């Protein structure tokens, strides 16, 4: 047992490892979207930039959990990063819709993880998740939802082009 470990349940430790893989899964999916929008037959560089940035942030989310695992004296155990669900992601609206459901899946996983920590009276881990993950997901879900609504507003063709400009600017 780690000389660090205190009030840290084995279930919370395993849930951290589960969340780490989920953050990496999201990172990989956003990276796929980024280079899908970089295809010559898609050519939406603002959408590409938005999902590239989303992918970098998910990588940061994963590493912060890796750091936290070690802080508490748990042990990082990594698993395969599953390839994304699709190879092509359709229109800008299609990809934002996928991104919304992905962010909500990550949020549900974090809420489940918070329930685990709370069930073991892990007050510090609960605050860590609230501060560094739960607030971010609410903001990210609202932001993408706004993108979806705007993308439906502007429609296909020129509208998608104009919104890509917004994401590039």
Query: Which residues sit in the known binding site for Fe cation?
Result: 23, 58, 61, 103, 137
Residue whose C-beta lies closest to Mg ion: 61
Q: What is the x/- site pattern for Mg ion, positions 13-52, by CB under 5 A?
A: ----------x-----------------------------
CB 128 within 8 A of CB 117: no
119 interface partner picked from a second copy, Mg ion, none, CB below 5 to 8 A per type: none
120 vs 99: CA distance, rounded Å: 32
23 interface partner picked from a second copy, Mg ion, none, CB below 5 to 8 A per type: Mg ion
61 interface partner picked from Mg ion, a second copy, none, CB below 5 to 8 A per type: Mg ion
Q: Which residues are annotated as a binding site for Fe(3+)?
A: 23, 58, 61
Query: Which of 107, 127, 108 shows the shortest CA–CA distance to 117?
Result: 127
Report phi then psi at 116, rounded to 5.
Answer: -65, -55
> Can you tell me which residue has the tokens 């508490």?
72
Which of 51, 58, 72, 116 forms a contact with a second copy (CB under 8 A)? 72
63 vs 102: CA distance, rounded Å: 19
162 belongs to the binding site for a second copy (CB under 8 A): yes
> Can you tell me which residue has the tokens 């609230």?
130
Which of 52, 61, 114, 147 forms a contact with Mg ion (CB under 5 A)? 61
Q: Which residues are annotated as a binding site?
A: 23, 58, 61, 103, 137
Angle, CA 128 vertex, CA 122 and CA 131 arms, to 5°: 135
Radius of gyration in angstroms for the set of CA atoms belonging to the chain, rounded to a whole number: 18
Shortest Å distance, C-beta 143 to a second copy: 9
Positions in the binding site for Mg ion (CB under 5 A): 23, 58, 61
């Amino acid at each position: 047992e780690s000389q660090c470990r205190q009030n840290y349940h084995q279930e919370s430790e395993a849930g951290i490892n589960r969340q780490i893989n989920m953050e990496l899964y999201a990172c990989y999916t956003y990276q796929s979207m980024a280079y899908y929008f970089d295809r010559d037959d898609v050519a939406l560089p603002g959408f590409s930039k938005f999902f590239k940035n989303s992918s970098d942030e998910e990588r940061e989310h994963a590493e912060k959990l890796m750091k936290y695992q070690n802080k508490r004296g748990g042990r990082v155990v990594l698993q395969d990063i599953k390839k994304p669900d699709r190879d092509e992601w359709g229109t800008g609206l299609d990809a934002m819709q996928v991104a919304l459901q992905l962010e909500k899946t990550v949020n549900q996983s974090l809420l489940d993880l918070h329930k685990v920590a709370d069930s073991h009276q892990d007050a510090q881990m609960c605050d860590f998740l609230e501060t560094h993950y739960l607030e971010e997901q609410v903001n990210a879900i609202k932001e993408i939802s706004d993108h979806i609504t705007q993308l439906k507003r502007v429609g296909s063709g020129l509208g998608e082009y104009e919104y890509d400009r917004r994401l590039d600017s």
